[PDB]
Amino acid sequence: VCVEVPSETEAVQGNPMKLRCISCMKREEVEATTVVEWFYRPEGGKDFLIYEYRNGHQEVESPFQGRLQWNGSKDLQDVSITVLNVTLNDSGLYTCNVSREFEFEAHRPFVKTTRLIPLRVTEEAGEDFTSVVSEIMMYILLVFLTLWLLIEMIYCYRKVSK
Amino acid sequence: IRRTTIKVLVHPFFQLFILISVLIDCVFMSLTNLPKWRPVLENTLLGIYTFEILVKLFARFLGDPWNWLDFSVTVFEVIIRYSPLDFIPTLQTARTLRILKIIPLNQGLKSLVGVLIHCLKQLIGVIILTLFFLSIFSLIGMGLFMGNLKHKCFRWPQENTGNPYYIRETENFYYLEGERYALLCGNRTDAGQCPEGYVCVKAGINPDQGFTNFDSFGWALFALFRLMAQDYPEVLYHQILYASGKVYMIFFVVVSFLFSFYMASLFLGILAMAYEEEKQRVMAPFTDLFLIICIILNVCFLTLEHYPMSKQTNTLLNIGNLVFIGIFTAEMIFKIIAMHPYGYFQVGWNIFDSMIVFHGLIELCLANVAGMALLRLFRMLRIFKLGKYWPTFQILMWSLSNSWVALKDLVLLLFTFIFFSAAFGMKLFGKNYEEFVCHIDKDCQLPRWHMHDFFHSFLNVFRILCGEWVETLWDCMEVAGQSWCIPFYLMVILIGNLLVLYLFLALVSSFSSQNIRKTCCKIVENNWFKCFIGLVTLLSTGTLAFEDIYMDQRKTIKILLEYADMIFTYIFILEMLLKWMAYGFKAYFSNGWYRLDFVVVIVFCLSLIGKTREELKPLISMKFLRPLRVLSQFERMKVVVRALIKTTLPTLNVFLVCLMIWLIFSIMGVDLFAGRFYECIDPTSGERFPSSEVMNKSRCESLLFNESMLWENAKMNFDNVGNGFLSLLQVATFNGWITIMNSAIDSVAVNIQPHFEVNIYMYCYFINFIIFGVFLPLSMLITVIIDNFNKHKIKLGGSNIFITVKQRKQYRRLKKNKLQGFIFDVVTSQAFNVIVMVLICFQAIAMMIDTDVQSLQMSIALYWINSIFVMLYTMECILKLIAFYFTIAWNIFDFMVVIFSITGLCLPMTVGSYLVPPSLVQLILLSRIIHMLRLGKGPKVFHNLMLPLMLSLPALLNIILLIFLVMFIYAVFGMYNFAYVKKEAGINDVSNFETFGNSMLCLFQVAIFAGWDGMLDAIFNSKWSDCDPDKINPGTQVRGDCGNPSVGIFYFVSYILISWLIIVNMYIVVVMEFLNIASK
Ligand SMILES: CCCCCCCCCCCCCCCCCC(=O)O[C@@H](COC(=O)CCCCCCCCCCCCCCC)COP(=O)(O)OCCN
Ligand SMILES: CCCCCCCCCCCCCCCCCC(=O)O[C@@H](COC(=O)CCCCCCCCCCCCCCC)COP(=O)(O)OCCN
Ligand SMILES: CCCCCCCCCCCCCCCCCC(=O)O[C@@H](COC(=O)CCCCCCCCCCCCCCC)COP(=O)(O)OCCN
Ligand SMILES: CC(C)CCC[C@@H](C)[C@H]1CC[C@H]2[C@@H]3CC=C4C[C@@H](O)CC[C@]4(C)[C@H]3CC[C@]12C
Ligand SMILES: CCCCCCCCCCCCCCCC(=O)O
Ligand SMILES: CCCCCCCCCCCCCCCC(=O)O
Ligand SMILES: CCCCCCCCCCCCCCCC(=O)O
Ligand SMILES: *[C@@H]1O[C@H](CO)[C@@H](O)[C@H](O)[C@H]1NC(C)=O
Ligand SMILES: *[C@@H]1O[C@H](CO)[C@@H](O)[C@H](O)[C@H]1NC(C)=O
């Protein structure tokens, strides 16, 4: 029921953007004490801080707060984050280092899975390339398919005349 | 000396006295456990039966085989009782054999069994062909699956009391919440998946105490015999598809097609021939409408009773009943005025109506207080009064009356055999069910199904006759050992099925007795135009399969489909507005097929507006009607739809009678069980409290000091007629019926905690339902379907009504050296041909020896055997090339087999690479055994038994294509509705609606009735809020988690009806061809 999908890596000045991030559990049945950390995104030392999760949400206690919102799922399967009014200064990498712990009352295994994305807030988004090339291909096909019929209702008509 | 004997032996009282004596013996042995008289009675009957022997043996004695039983039992008993021998348990077993005397002591049954055993000799061919095929497919099963079910999730890395027969090794392997056996898994991409921190390994025991495996021949034959019956199969599918990929699902489809259909059609057609071979050898009279209205309203008043029900409507229904007896007791004392009653009590119907008025003036005075509630159960008998006016019911009943004298004997024989098997089983196995109870059930108590007493053994036999045998046979083998349990079960299964089916055929036999216009009118009909739009129709159909949960992950494809939908609607619009130019406007709507096309053009138009506005988004569901365009496009579909209409619609007339009987049983249930299925449960574990802790509801809702308790209803109940019909349908398909029966037999009273097995006798209700509501109506339908199939087969002739006029020519074509290389004179010889066959046979028998646990000295001595066989095959192919073409198709098949065999035995030059799997070559060589069905080169009966499949392939192809189109429509609609349902019960990691593949496997196991209740019970998650309406699902635009019962019920019921109606015709197609060939 979970599905893993990359994020858009493209963002428009004057809008929010959602940084989706998904990390499925191989068995849906078990339960795990998740921890989630998002890293700094800057052209020097990226690792600094963004928005960590321990047992309840906490505050960045630095200057990367206020324009942020938790958009994650209730069971922490998905930990998506929305940034507000992205500005030209905002740029580069984002990294999400989720980790989990299981409890089978025998062996307590621990697993860790990084996930990282670039972003650049271009001055304005151009149109998507696929969603114009496909509209050209469609309109061309619908032109051909409507000259063909006309050619037939010339040839057959001329034949029927006699 | 021997004279006076006759004057006894032939006087009828010598028959009647012994019949009475046997009925006393068999009652007092079985329906009683009253002792202190069993040392007197047996010493009496050992006198009587010896008087019988010492009479009968003087007149004649061994001329009749029944006299071997009579003598051989009683001589052995006489050797026991009075000698030092004392095999007491064995003595009491043999006496159960006396029950069978009812056969020879009733000449009717003696002759019926005589002709049945005579006609048994017609079957020998089919039984051998069936065992041959079971052996081949079980060798294939050992090829594909041997060892797989030992897979488990093993804890890794490795780090450093109770009932002994239920300890789990949970420190080492991973178990689900409640299951007894470890989770199956596999290395493949689509197998099961381990939890984190576990690795897949082959270790330890198989499931089911070892009885479910493919690790040797024998048990594989057990598994295939289980699959042929398709008895409780779906857990085997689950285990195989967890141990190995979904790709292996092809195997079970092929197996169920060969065995559960064709072989059973051969048996049914042969017994249906044998039956006819046997049979050929033998003052206000007119004012009625008032009273029929004052019947139908009385019927309707009965249906409104339910639970709960307020007094201000109970008193309504009470006055209603009084009023209707205030009418019937008027009209009786009108009709008893017709001069006298001596005609009144002469006509058959009034000797029923006066019973109705006597019952209805019992239950109104001095039967209101201090009277038993079952007196009211007879009120339902009133619905039969409607039958007085209804010709169909009357002529069916009359047809049953005619046949009475024959059916009596078949019913009495079947009852005799059930009673014999029940008694013999109780004496043979009963003690073991208590000596070793601790294996069968935790807490060391007898389970619900056992053999410790006569009534439970009787129910167990009736259940074996319904099927269901494997789940009890596992306990039989677990308690009494296999060598005893297997012959008993196999005997009951075989002779039971034979009697049941011969009775079914007896019932069926009983019942059956401006030139632009010419331009467009050409452009529409050129064949290229047809094929183009046909292609567009199949493209526009297949594109719905891509809309699974991964739609948003396939980011690119979505945009292409988004434009393709508009291309397709454009083409169909230029089709419509051309046909209206051509045919003329009005003539377009006259023709029924173009109307369906028009409806599909509307579906395309609504679907494309809906997605433009959110408030109209629900319209986008309409597009799932698109596949219906296929049905009107292709000539092959229309002939099939017409054949189904021509054959099956006329059954509607008799269907109302079956609905009437089902309504009778539904009311008869609502009266007897409504509101009593409530129970008090632990809200976490779902098990009940015992009756000692929480006897009534008041303690189930205590005043908060200790309230770890929940009072709730049961998913299936008889609280009103609409739940009744659904519970009845669930009984009729033998799915989940055991949970209903457990609810019934546990139920006490409206607010009383149900207690284990209190009124066990309610099993009579379901026995009676299974006899009268299912078995008889089913044949009442099949006989009408056959009568119309014959009608139409005569109204035009034709090979079938299920095939197009072009295919009839195909049907009629299908039905039809000198240079001293003398090897030509050798390869032709019988002596060489028989040798080739002996080699093929030896190679198969030399394959049966293999097993999973196996020493290396044996494995290499099998490897070099298969290598010798590839050498022999290559040598004979080289010799054949001297006496010589690649023209013969079988000689192409053999040369392919040789090439593939060597390119596997030696692989790439015997040193080249790996991962060519061992035991591929064995299956390659095995494939040649198909030669033993060819006309000139094997047993002639195997060809004569395979001929119907050849002569019926086209109609089956057409029907299979229509089944596939219907399964496609239902798959797409379920894939849109029932994704995101929480995984539970019959919804799991393999059968679910996440994708088209899994939806097709669900609809398959539904069509075979392999547990549709387990899916419906998952759809009913909203029935007590076991769900989360707003749950975010990652990667997906859809929020929530909930099924919808109202849509679920409709979906499953309609699919079950349509599938059953198609499959019945698919059976008819084969059975009538077998019966046609067998005419010669
Ligand atoms: C518990 C046994 C399993 C373990 C071992 C299995 C070993 C393989 C057994 C070899 C069987 C070979 C023949 C199989 C025929 C099966 C019958 C059959 O399925 O065909 C039709 C039904 O069969 C018939 O109509 C004809 C059956 C007569 C066959 C035997 C004639 C009498 C033989 C009596 C000998 C007593 C045997 C004593 C044991 C040594 C279809 O009906 P259905 O089962 O699909 O539907 C079930 C409805 N309740
Ligand atoms: C005049 C021409 C004659 C030609 C004859 C040709 C026959 C054509 C064949 C038509 C194809 C029929 C399709 C299926 C036939 C098998 C039906 C059967 O024997 O039993 C069914 C009846 O259903 C049952 O209830 C089985 C258990 C019945 C219990 C037996 C106890 C009753 C005995 C008491 C006798 C009293 C009867 C009353 C007499 C007045 C079981 O259905 P199923 O599970 O096999 O369906 C397939 C699943 N997809
Ligand atoms: C009238 C009917 C005629 C009856 C006569 C039938 C006799 C024909 C016998 C020939 C059987 C052909 C089966 C060949 C498939 C090869 C299976 C295989 O071994 O594939 C390997 C490759 O894996 C695959 O599964 C690839 C996809 C093939 C699976 C297909 C299974 C369905 C087979 C249908 C059986 C029906 C044959 C009879 C048709 C009339 C598995 O290797 P592994 O390493 O994964 O397993 C061991 C590791 N522990
Ligand atoms: C066409 C391809 C792609 C799929 C296979 C089509 C046909 C052969 C499939 C689809 C549905 C299948 C049927 C589903 C139900 C039954 C009833 C069972 O008692 C015998 C097998 C039988 C009759 C199956 C035979 C094979 C079957 C008819
Ligand atoms: C130990 C249990 C054995 C039970 C079966 C005993 C053998 C019964 C045989 C009955 C044969 C009936 C046919 C007789 C000949 C005929 O009429 O054609
Ligand atoms: C026509 C009769 C066929 C009889 C075939 C019976 C096959 C089923 C019994 C299989 C037993 C296999 C060996 C049991 C002991 C073990 O598990 O090692
Ligand atoms: C893909 C959805 C399932 C479709 C199932 C039904 C397929 C029917 C195929 C009919 C083949 C007709 C061949 C002739 C066509 C032509 O004349 O061009
Ligand atoms: C998250 O993963 C690494 C783990 O080595 C962690 O040390 C660091 O904070 C993050 N780096 C990356 C590349 O994700
Ligand atoms: C059952 O209810 C009765 C009254 O209907 C009450 O007297 C009795 O105590 C109840 N049983 C309990 C509380 O176990």
Author numbering:
A (entry chain B): 25 to 186
B (entry chain A): 107 to 166, 175 to 274, 283 to 404, 503 to 733, 921 to 1223, 1238 to 1304, 1308 to 1504
Give sentences copied directly from the paper behind this entry.
To facilitate cryogenic electron microscopy (cryo-EM) analysis, human NaX was co-expressed with the canonical auxiliary β3-subunit, purified in mild detergent (glyco-diosgenin), and reconstituted into phospholipid nanodiscs. Prior to sample vitrification, the Na+ concentration was raised above the threshold reported to activate NaX (to 200 mM), and the resulting cryo-EM reconstruction of the β3-NaX complex extended to 3.2 Å resolution. The NaX channel resembles a four-leaf clover with VSLDs arranged in a domain-swapped organization. The β3-subunit is wedged between extracellular loops of the pore module and its single transmembrane helix is positioned against VSLD3. The intracellular DIII–DIV linker is bound alongside the pore (see below), and the carboxyl-terminal domain is not well-resolved, establishing that the overall architecture of NaX is highly similar to available human NaV channel structures determined in detergent. Despite the high Na+ concentration in our sample, no distinguishing extracellular Na+ binding site was observed, and residues lining the narrow S6-gate form a hydrophobic barrier to the passage of hydrated ions, defining a nonconductive state. Four lipids penetrate the lateral pore fenestrations in NaX to enter the central cavity. These features can unambiguously be assigned as three phospholipids and one cholesterol, where one phospholipid even straddles and seals the intracellular S6-gate. The NaX DIII–DIV linker is bound to a pore module receptor site reminiscent of the fast-inactivated state in NaV channels. The DIII–DIV linker therefore appears to restrict S6-dilation in NaX and may stabilize the nonconductive state.
Unlike classical voltage-gated sodium (NaV) channels, NaX has been characterized as a voltage-insensitive, tetrodotoxin-resistant, sodium (Na+)-activated channel involved in regulating Na+ homeostasis. Here, to gain insight into its atypical physiology, we determine structures of the human NaX channel in complex with the auxiliary β3-subunit. NaX reveals structural alterations within the selectivity filter, voltage sensor-like domains, and pore module. Instead, the S6-gate remains closed, membrane lipids fill the central cavity, and the domain III-IV linker restricts S6-dilation.
